[PDB]
């Protein structure tokens, strides 16, 4: 209930760092973003034993609810990290982007990249022949401040790109088609 009451009021972030089974999996699903640690965390309502007993399927915990499964197949997790330390560092970095509540504007921090910087490399990025693809991530990197881009679901549904970046120090959300 509290999760649902807090949705859209204050950001909520979940980091799955170990086993997580049963109804406990639903609270992270209600939060805004879910991150997973590789090889040591998993999410599933029912464990492999019940799956084998009921549907006669053989699967391991990693296959059933591993970080790779939920970051590449189910679209449940947003990012997978190598370690607890790496995950926590990236979590701090990510938290830097968000506002504290819906009553506050988008965070604006000190910026060194000039807002009028030209990007001549984009003048020929798009091939003339519509049968050749390019990488939209290159355009995104060129346009944003310091070429820094925090991508969301980088390995899931790769035909679209979503993420966080900064323009003139102000947090922005990037959505783009991926012709590649």
């Amino acid at each position: 209930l509290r999760n649902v009451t807090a949705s859209g009021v204050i950001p909520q972030i979940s980091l799955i760092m170990g086993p997580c089974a049963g109804g406990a999996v639903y609270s992270p699903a209600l939060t805004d973003f879910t991150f997973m640690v590789k090889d040591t965390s998993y999410l599933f309502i029912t464990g492999p034993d019940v799956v084998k007993s009921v549907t006669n399927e053989d699967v391991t915990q990693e296959e059933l609810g591993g970080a790779k499964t939920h970051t590449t197949m189910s679209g449940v997790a947003h990012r997978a990290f190598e370690n607890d330390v790496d995950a926590l560092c990236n979590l701090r970095d990510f938290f830097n982007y968000l506002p504290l509540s819906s009553q506050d504007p988008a965070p604006v921090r000190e910026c060194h990249d000039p807002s009028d910087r030209l990007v001549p490399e984009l003048d020929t990025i798009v091939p003339l022949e519509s049968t050749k693809a390019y990488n939209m991530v290159d355009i995104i990197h060129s346009v944003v401040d310091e070429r820094e881009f925090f991508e969301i679901m980088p390995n899931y549904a790769k035909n679209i790109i979503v993420g966080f970046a900064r323009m003139n120090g102000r947090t922005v959300g990037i959505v783009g088609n991926q012709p590649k």
């Binding site: 370690n83 560092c89 000039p114 290159d138």
Partner: protein, 670 residues
């Protein structure tokens, strides 16, 4: 005020086309340029007043397709053609077609090019011009007195070689007649015992064969001027990397003797353009004719700087038939110039390996003193598989050799190239190398100085401490900037009050304890017990960061960084990967399990269902990283598959016209 061709067509791509166009605009000549399909937006096409496509991307179908160029010349009413270097500079047939259409060719006559083209005649012409002899002996050496006769005809030093065998068995250098008699006797006995063949050959030998070449300028009137020599000894894979003028080895007497003999040869063959007479020079300053280049060379700018002369302008004036305005006595050596050709190659693989990609950012260091850059690329340029990897010629000029070498090192540290791998690290290390600085150089310099391979700069204890301090200061600066939010009335921010940052920094499998504090823009860093001070503006967005460590000025680049702690730093031209953690984070990291990390990129598989349009590789072929292996079509998008890494094709599992599926093996790389 000097009449010249009204319009000129430059049949070349890359830096040379841009270089010629700049001169034509300077002289008021209108310009036309030829481009393949892929080079449509290249700087030369943009620079040219008019441009014409001459064909498909492969060079054979474009630059070497004379018919397409000829139609273009007719279409543009082009008065004259400048061929630059490579491609059709030396092709006789093109000159004939130009002559048929009454188009002036800016260069020498076909006979002069052909005469030098033949090795056998070129020597007879060199002997007749009385230039240092380079004799070739087709017959066998019968005895030790015939060996001495032949050695005197060739000139000392000579190399005695066995006709059979390999690996340098039965080879001897002889410096005089007595060493020839023993060298022949010993080599014949060694060859008879090792190979059952006593037949010997005698060729000239060159101690430390420094490659020294004299530029020459010729006119229809028959007047000729010698330009000062150029040292091009530093070379990789038979391709020159660093060139300098004048040579640090030649005195005023030898240099003049070389210049006079090069002009004697040029007059003997009635040369009518800028050219180069190449020599091998031994440790005793004996010089021997190698070949006479009959085209403007790539290393022409270093000569232009010391002489003060524009070779392209002179080539155009001679083509109009205007007489030369200079006499040998007017040609001085002013200062010192060094050129370092820049390539898109991995210096670490072999000495150079071709690399391909889009230049996502490119910034030349022109602002720095005594720097001239000859390039044919811009930001967004695509270094393609079809052509030479040369990014630019980087040239530095000084009042003396030291000043030129210092400005170069500074220029290489200030050169920004992003999106391809490049040889700047190798160039920068050659320029500062104690042998190169002393002028102890030969054509073997790169193999002698780096026998195992290029491993990048090697840091001295002080350099390592400076690099660690700079990295720690950069890390702390990023962390500090992370805390500078704008005012939030609802929730004021509370500054994290930290006086000292304790960091574990991993450089090369070694972990260093660092304690960093700051005051204003000054960072005090204790590295393993050594105190350093780092000062800078700490602009974290600019590609180049200038810092002062204990008063020593450094220019560093931050190529990439991650929240985890990884950081790539270009320092002294080399890219070092460091990993920075806080002390507590480093301590807690000890409980993390090392992962398998097994992910082979050798196998290349199909990402999505489709039809294989074409396959660009076959077993045994060499593929550079990022090089296309095959193209897959789906929903008419011509998807391209790229090689994971540089290597060869162990096996090709796909064929054109075959409907592949996702997760299907396409090719294997070693």
């Amino acid at each position: 005020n000097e009449k010249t061709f009204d319009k000129i067509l430059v049949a070349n791509r890359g830096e040379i086309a841009c270089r010629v166009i700049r001169t034509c605009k300077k002289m008021g000549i209108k310009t036309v340029a030829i481009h393949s399909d892929v080079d449509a937006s290249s700087v030369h096409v943009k620079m040219a007043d008019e441009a014409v496509c001459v064909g498909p991307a492969p060079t054979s179908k474009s630059y070497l397709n004379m018919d397409a160029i000829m139609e273009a010349i007719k279409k543009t009413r082009a008065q004259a053609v400048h061929p630059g270097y490579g491609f059709l500079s030396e092709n006789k047939e093109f000159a004939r077609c130009l002559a048929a259409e009454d188009v002036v060719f800016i260069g020498p006559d076909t006979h002069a090019i052909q005469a030098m083209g033949d090795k056998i005649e070129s020597k007879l012409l060199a002997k007749k011009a009385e230039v240092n002899t380079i004799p070739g002996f087709d017959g066998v050496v019968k005895d030790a007195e015939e060996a001495v006769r032949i050695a005197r005809e060739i000139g000392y030093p000579v190399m005695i070689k066995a006709s059979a065998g390999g690996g340098g068995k039965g080879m001897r250098i002889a410096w005089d007649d007595e060493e020839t008699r023993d060298g022949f006797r010993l080599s014949s006995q060694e060859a008879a015992s090792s190979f059952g063949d006593d037949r010997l050959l005698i060729e000239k030998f060159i101690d430390n064969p420094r490659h020294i070449e004299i530029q020459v300028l010729g006119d229809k009137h028959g007047n000729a001027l010698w330009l000062n020599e150029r040292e091009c000894s530093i070379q990789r894979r038979n391709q020159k990397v660093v060139e300098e003028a004048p040579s640090i080895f030649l005195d005023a007497e030898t240099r003049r003797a070389m210049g006079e003999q090069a002009v004697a040869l040029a007059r003997a063959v009635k040369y009518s353009s800028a050219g180069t007479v190449e020599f091998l020079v031994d440790s005793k300053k004996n010089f021997y004719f190698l070949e006479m280049n009959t085209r403007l060379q790539v290393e022409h700018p270093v000569t232009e700087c010391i002489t003060g002369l524009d070779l392209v302008q002179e080539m155009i004036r001679v083509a109009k038939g205007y007489p030369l305005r200079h006499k040998q006595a007017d040609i001085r050596i002013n200062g010192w110039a060094v050129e370092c050709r820049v390539y898109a190659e991995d210096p670490y693989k072999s000495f150079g390996l071709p690399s391909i990609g889009r230049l996502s950012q490119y910034q030349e260091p022109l602002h720095l003193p005594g720097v001239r850059v000859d390039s044919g690329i811009q930001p967004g340029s695509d270094i393609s598989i079809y052509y030479d990897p040369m990014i630019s010629k980087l040239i530095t000029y000084g009042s003396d050799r030291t000043e030129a070498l210092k400005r170069m090192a500074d220029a290489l540290d200030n050169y920004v190239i992003r999106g391809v791998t490049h040889n700047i690290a190798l160039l920068r290390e050659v320029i500062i190398n104690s042998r190169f600085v002393k002028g102890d150089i030969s054509t073997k310099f790169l193999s002698d100085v780096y026998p195992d391979g290029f491993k990048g700069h090697m840091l001295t204890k002080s350099e390592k401490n400076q690099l660690l301090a700079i990295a720690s200061s950069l890390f702390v600066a990023f962390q500090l900037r992370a805390q500078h939010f704008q005012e939030n009335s609802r929730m004021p921010v509370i500054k994290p009050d930290i006086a000292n940052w304790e960091l574990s920094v991993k450089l090369h499998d070694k972990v260093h304890t660092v304690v960093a504090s700051n005051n204003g823009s000054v960072f005090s860093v204790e590295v393993d017990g050594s105190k350093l001070n780092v000062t800078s503006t700490w602009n974290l967005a600019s590609p180049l960061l200038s810092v002062s460590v204990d008063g020593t000025q450094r220019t560093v680049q931050c190529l990439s960084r991650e929240a985890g702690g990884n950081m790539s730093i270009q320092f002294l031209g080399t890219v070092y990967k460091v990993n920075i953690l806080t002390r507590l984070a480093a301590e807690l990291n000890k409980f993390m399990l090392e992962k398998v990390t097994e992910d082979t990129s050798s196998v290349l598989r199909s990402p999505m269902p489709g039809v294989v349009v074409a396959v660009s590789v076959k077993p045994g072929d060499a593929v550079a990283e990022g090089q296309e292996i095959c193209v897959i079509e789906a929903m008419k998008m011509q998807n391209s598959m790229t090689a994971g890494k540089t290597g060869t094709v162990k096996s090709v599992h796909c064929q054109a016209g075959d409907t592949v599926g996702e997760g299907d093996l396409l090719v294997e790389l070693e």
